[PDB]
Design a protein around this nucleic acid. Structure first.
Ligand SMILES: [Mg+2]
Ligand SMILES: [Mg+2]
Ligand SMILES: [Mg+2]
Ligand SMILES: [Mg+2]
Ligand SMILES: [Mg+2]
Ligand SMILES: [Mg+2]
Ligand SMILES: [Mg+2]
Ligand SMILES: [Mg+2]
Ligand SMILES: [Mg+2]
Ligand SMILES: [Mg+2]
Ligand SMILES: [Mg+2]
Ligand SMILES: [Mg+2]
Ligand SMILES: [Mg+2]
Ligand SMILES: [Mg+2]
Ligand SMILES: [Mg+2]
Ligand SMILES: [Mg+2]
Ligand SMILES: [Mg+2]
Ligand SMILES: [Mg+2]
Ligand SMILES: [Mg+2]
Ligand SMILES: [Mg+2]
Ligand SMILES: [Mg+2]
Ligand SMILES: [Mg+2]
Ligand SMILES: [Mg+2]
Lengths: 100, 67, 143, 145, 63, 141, 82, 206
RNA sequence: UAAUUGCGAUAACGAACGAGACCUUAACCUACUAAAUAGUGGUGCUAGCAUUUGCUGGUUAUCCACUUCUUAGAGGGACUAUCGGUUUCAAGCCGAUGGAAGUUUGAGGCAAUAACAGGUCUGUGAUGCCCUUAGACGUUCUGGGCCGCACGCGCGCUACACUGACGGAGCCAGCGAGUCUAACCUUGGCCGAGAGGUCUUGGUAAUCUUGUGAAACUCCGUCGUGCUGGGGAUAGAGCAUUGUAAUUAUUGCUCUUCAACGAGGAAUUCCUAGUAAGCGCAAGUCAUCAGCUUGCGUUGAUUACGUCCCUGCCCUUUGUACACACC
RNA sequence: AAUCCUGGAUGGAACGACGAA
């Protein structure tokens, strides 16, 4: 049935809580799976002058957004799949499931 | 330089003030009981505290220490 | 014991194979040879000029033997180089594409290279045998 | 690998296209002394004339030299691809010539004169002696002449 | 062509307004029991060796 | 299964993986023998551990290294480190410990970096200059 | 339009670029007696240019008068063969 | 000695330079005893190397460069004047060529030749701006072994470079003739000329 | 002591802020968790050479096993550990051994009280007051200009050549960006000298572009001390792309032209290790235009490890006719 | 068992600034 679930958040511990509760659900239902593949986090850098105006010493500022991405592949019936998507959601965490 | 601060020194002095018949002159075991007997937010500060406790025990084993 | 392109030095192999191809004298030459620079970044044509299509052909044969698949884009990226834009700072510039394209066409014609799936060009068994035997000659000249 | 001793056939500075070309240096970079002839054009003509490029110019036959200048002043007849030409689609007849020693600067002059009598911006700019390609003139080209 | 070898036994301190000089008390290898104070231009350690072009001179010690 | 390990050598950004097993003494580099490394001088720099410990210790064993990252010199240094470390790992696991420790002592007597990777890494670029410590140029008037 | 310099000139040497029989047999007799031979030697001595010098080094090394010990590009080294 | 052969054919010259003896590129580090002491403990020999390239970190501590082999120091002082910064491979190649030249000429060990040159071109006295204020002048002082070695290498390389610039002689052969003239004692060498004028100035300002 | 960091002394005791602590990042883990969107080995099929085992490779539905390399998550690890010296013998400092790492491990982020009548109403639908407010200083359309040049300064790019220019081969990185109601990064095939064009393809991206097959670099050769094949400004002609539109050339390509510059005077800037310097690369701005900046990595030196002479900073004592404070 | 000892410095040039607060 071969679903993938990807989790593409910024909050690492919320993300890991979601991954953890999902995998323990998987093993209590006895579902084989490829474990949490932790993709390389990607750092949206933005470099700007601190100043609005032009004068001053040329001081710069690198703001960063860390995006942490994980995914898990499951083999399971669609009933457990749909209730899985019904459960295991958090604030500040974007999830998407995909079949095949 | 390698000077330590009054947080470290005071905490070490307290640990020695009330856990002498205990920890010995080895930084590793001193660390591994200081993390148990005091709650500390940082491993780095913990290791600094443990090093100073070891130094103070080394001082104590040859004569006393003021304070 | 077994011989292949990898057990022989590159410069010597390529010189040997280009001499073999120049003596064979059947591969192809387009006609716009002895006119061109091989790259927008070069400022002169080659200096040998009684050849060098054979040299480039040998080099790409070695390269495709090493790799899985290539294309004129990859070869332009490889044989391109630092263009002196006069007063402005140097920069990488891709090479001339017609050259390497017609090289690959001539090699497909003579049967050293074939077209591959996933796009591009690949070494076939005929070119593999040929290059292996040329390298054999190239290191048995050592005796 | 072998050294040809020499004969008395060698000559120093020679003459062609009203230009005292220097010998004792290789033929291509010698002919580049001619105005309207650069490294590309010279290498190409010395190839199409069937000349050994390893040879110095001072040891060559008048046959080779006249063949070369014939190719120079009539290039498109010898399979030169018509985009090597310094003056193509000329300005009047639509044909693609190749200018040489004195014709280069005379044609430059009459181009400037065309633009000046037309009173175009480039011509006025040239007539004043300034820069034409949109370069800045506030802080460069001070000692312009 | 005489020169004198001298072994460094004690580095005293730096000297010169810009600190590119060092006072050292040395020990003459030949004719030992003789110790003299000298300036040096570069880096120096104890037990290094110096080649005095002339031995009969010592610097104004900074005391 | 026959005795085999896999190790790695490192530099600024190069990594040289090294598969070491039992064989007849072939030392290949990414497709090719060790005699074709192409600086032509750090060829001798990479021969070092072999020439040190004696080639007799390479007859029973074949090494194959795959190198990626860095530039040419750094790939060479990754190669030599991975080679020495793989030899030492073999002599630790399969052969006794005395051979391993005298081998290690020889490597570290010649050159420390053969078995341990140097700690120097690039300092980041700071603004106001082209580099970390450099600044552009001051003009007061 | 000042110099902040004056930039004195040189003698503008006149090294040969073609040879003849006198220069050639001179090369053949004088390349021996040289313990070390290369392009700079055969230009500070015999006044050929570097092109002639490279050709001559290949020529002499062909028949065997000057022994090589390393033939790196941009620096060719040769001594005399005993 | 044993000729051993591998699945990959290791050549016999590399087998010999491995197991016979530890050479340079192709030269032995023995028979290079320094005759003039006071530079021993600072010219690192008896720690042989197959090449002059090493990713060695000597500029972390003060006197650690003295444990770096002199030939790496020479290669390092070669690559300068801008365009040539970095490019240590070229310095190594130039050094190898130079030592080949110093073997064909003056058949002694080229390593003995360069250490002799270092010993001879080491300025022993040098000056400095000293004073207590306005009383400022060029007072003479001793020179240390390490600075002697450093100044020697600097003078040799700078003379070779200034000679090789704008002429036909290679940097290699300029360096070679400079080193040999220095090891002999010549007064034609750039390094020796600078040395003797420095020593004369030091003498005059005692 | 980097440090009002601390030992301690003590009409002060006890505290707070700052520093430190901290957070991020880079370096170690063959110890844990795993991973055809990263790899490795083996076994299937298969190409070539050897054939005598073997060597190099290819292989998507051939599967099997593993995680050293790679990714991350959770943790560990260094605290100057141990030893020897030295100091009232305390804080601490030096050296050596070990160790991935012993300059507060390295680089940064945050960063006090009090101020400048520093800069900015041209960032603000942040704004007081004044001005203007329908032929408006509103708003918008066309065309110019901000590039304009007798000169004077500043940040920089090119070089003044053999440690070199050029032609061939060799051939190695890292940080990152990318299309939706759009049209982006583009592979591959074909045409064209070239720029570039065209037919398709992959990718919302560890998956595809991209091993971004970068450049300097190495090896072979040509040149040969000649303002010379160094240098490539200034000009002429033509061909392509962006865009409604390029004319004071937007840029790119081709040919030709081939100027100063022969290492830079008074002065002056930056820099102490993977740092300077060389070398190019991605992003930012962006329809097109990098010679700039923000970061990235490749190659990788010399010389201190010190002083307060110059320029300044801190603390204390001292003097002062200074207080918008030595201008 | 031999044995004699020390403390210590200077060092050129460098004019000026509207007042208001
Ligand atoms: Mg290339
Ligand atoms: Mg840099
Ligand atoms: Mg450059
Ligand atoms: Mg020269
Ligand atoms: Mg397979
Ligand atoms: Mg201690
Ligand atoms: Mg820090
Ligand atoms: Mg504002
Ligand atoms: Mg308006
Ligand atoms: Mg403007
Ligand atoms: Mg600026
Ligand atoms: Mg090149
Ligand atoms: Mg990469
Ligand atoms: Mg040029
Ligand atoms: Mg851009
Ligand atoms: Mg614009
Ligand atoms: Mg800008
Ligand atoms: Mg200053
Ligand atoms: Mg007074
Ligand atoms: Mg007052
Ligand atoms: Mg005053
Ligand atoms: Mg007055
Ligand atoms: Mg007055």
């Amino acid at each position: 049935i071969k679903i993938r679930i990807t989790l593409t958040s910024t909050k690492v511990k919320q993300l890991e809580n979601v991954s953890s509760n999902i995998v323990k659900n998987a093993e209590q239902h006895n579902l084989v799976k490829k474990g949490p593949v932790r993709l390389p986090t990607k750092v949206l850098k933005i470099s700007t002058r601190k100043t609005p105006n032009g004068e001053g010493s040329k001081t710069w500022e690198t703001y960063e957004m860390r995006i942490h991405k994980r995914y898990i592949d499951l083999e399971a019936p669609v009933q457990i799949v749909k209730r899985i998507t019904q459960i295991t959601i958090e604030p500040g965490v974007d999830v998407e499931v995909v079949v095949a | 330089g390698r000077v330590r601060t009054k947080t470290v020194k005071r905490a070490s002095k307290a640990l020695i003030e009330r856990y002498y018949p205990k920890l010995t002159l080895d930084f590793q075991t001193n660390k591994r009981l200081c993390d148990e007997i005091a709650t500390i937010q940082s491993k780095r500060l913990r290791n600094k505290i443990a090093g100073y406790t070891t130094h103070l025990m080394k001082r104590i084993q040859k004569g006393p220490v003021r304070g | 014991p077994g011989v292949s392109v990898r057990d022989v030095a590159a410069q010597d192999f390529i010189n040997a194979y280009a001499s073999f191809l120049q003596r064979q004298g059947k591969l192809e030459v387009p006609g716009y040879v002895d006119i061109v620079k091989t790259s927008s970044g070069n400022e002169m044509p080659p200096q040998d000029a009684e050849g060098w299509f054979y040299k480039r052909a040998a080099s790409v044969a070695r390269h495709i033997y090493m790799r899985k698949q290539v294309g004129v884009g990859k070869l332009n990226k490889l044989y391109g180089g630092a263009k002196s834009r006069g007063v402005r700072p140097y920069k990488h510039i891709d090479a001339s594409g017609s050259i390497n394209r017609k090289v690959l066409q001539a090699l497909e014609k003579i049967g050293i290279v074939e077209i591959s799936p996933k796009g591009g060009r690949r070494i076939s068994e005929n070119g593999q045998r040929d290059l292996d035997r040329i390298a054999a000659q190239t290191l048995e000249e050592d005796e | 690998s072998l050294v040809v001793q020499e004969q008395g056939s060698f000559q120093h500075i020679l003459r062609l296209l009203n230009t005292n070309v220097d010998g004792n240096i290789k033929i291509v970079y010698a002919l580049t002394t001619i105005k309207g002839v650069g490294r590309r054009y010279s290498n190409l003509v010395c190839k199409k004339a069937d000349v050994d490029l390893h040879k110095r110019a001072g040891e060559l036959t008048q046959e080779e030299l006249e063949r070369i200048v014939q190719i120079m002043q009539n290039p498109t007849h010898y399979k030169i691809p018509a985009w090597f030409l310094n003056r193509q689609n000329d300005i009047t007849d639509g044909k693609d010539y190749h200018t040489l020693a004195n014709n280069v600067e005379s044609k430059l002059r009459d181009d400037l004169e065309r633009l000046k009598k037309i009173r175009a911006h480039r011509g006025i700019r040239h007539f004043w002696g300034l820069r034409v390609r949109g370069q800045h003139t506030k802080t460069t080209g001070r000692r312009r002449a | 062509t005489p020169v004198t070898l001298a072994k460094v036994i004690k580095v005293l301190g730096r000297t010169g307004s810009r600190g590119g000089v060092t006072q050292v008390r040395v020990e003459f290898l030949e004719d030992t029991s003789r110790t003299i104070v000298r300036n040096v231009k570069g880096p120096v350690r104890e037990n290094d060796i110096l080649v005095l072009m002339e031995s009969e001179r010592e610097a104004r010690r900074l005391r | 299964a026959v005795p085999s390990v896999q190790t790695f050598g490192k530099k600024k950004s190069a990594t040289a993986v090294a598969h070491v097993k039992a064989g007849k003494g072939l030392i290949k580099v990414n497709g090719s023998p060790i005699t074709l490394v192409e600086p032509e001088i750090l060829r001798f720099k990479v021969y070092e551990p072999l020439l040190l410990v004696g080639l007799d210790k390479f007859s029973n064993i074949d090494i194959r290294v795959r190198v990626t990252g860095g530039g040419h010199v750094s790939q060479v240094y990754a190669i030599r480190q991975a080679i020495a470390k793989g030899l030492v790992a073999y002599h630790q696991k399969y052969v006794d410990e005395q051979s391993k420790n005298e081998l290690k002592k020889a490597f570290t007597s010649y050159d420390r970096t053969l078995l341990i990777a140097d700690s120097r890494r690039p300092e980041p670029k700071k603004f106001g200059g082209k580099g970390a410590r450099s600044r552009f140029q001051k003009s007061y008037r | 339009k000042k110099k902040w310099s004056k930039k004195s000139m040189k003698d503008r040497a006149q090294h040969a670029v073609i040879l003849d029989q006198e220069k050639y047999d001179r090369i053949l007799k004088e390349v021996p007696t040289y313990r070390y031979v290369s392009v700079s030697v055969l230009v500070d001595r015999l006044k050929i240019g570097g092109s002639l010098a490279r050709i001559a080094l290949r020529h002499l090394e062909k028949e065997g008068i000057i022994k090589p010990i390393s033939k790196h590009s941009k620096q060719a080294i040769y001594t005399r063969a005993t | 000695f044993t000729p051993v052969v591998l699945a990959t054919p290791i050549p016999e010259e590399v087998q010999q330079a491995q197991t016979e003896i530890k050479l340079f590129n192709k030269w032995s580090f023995e028979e290079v005893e320094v005759k003039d002491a006071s530079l021993v403990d600072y010219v690192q020999v008896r720690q042989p190397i197959f090449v002059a390239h090493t990713a060695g970190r000597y500029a972390n501590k003060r006197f650690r460069k003295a444990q770096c082999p002199i030939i790496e120091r020479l290669t390092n002082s070669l690559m300068m004047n801008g365009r040539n910064n970095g490019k240590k491979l070229k310095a190594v190649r130039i050094i190898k060529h130079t030592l080949d030249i110093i073997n064909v000429l003056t058949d002694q060990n080229p390593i003995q030749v360069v250490v002799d040159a270092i010993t001879n071109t080491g300025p022993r006295e040098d000056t400095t701006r000293v004073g207590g204020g306005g009383a400022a002048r060029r007072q003479a002082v001793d020179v240390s072994p390490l600075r002697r070695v450093n100044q020697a290498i600097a003078l040799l390389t700078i003379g070779a470079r200034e000679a090789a610039f704008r002429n036909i002689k290679t940097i290699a052969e300029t360096l070679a003739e400079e080193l040999i003239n220095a090891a002999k004692g010549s007064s034609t060498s750039y390094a020796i000329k600078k040395k003797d004028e420095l020593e004369r100035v030091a003498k005059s300002n005692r």
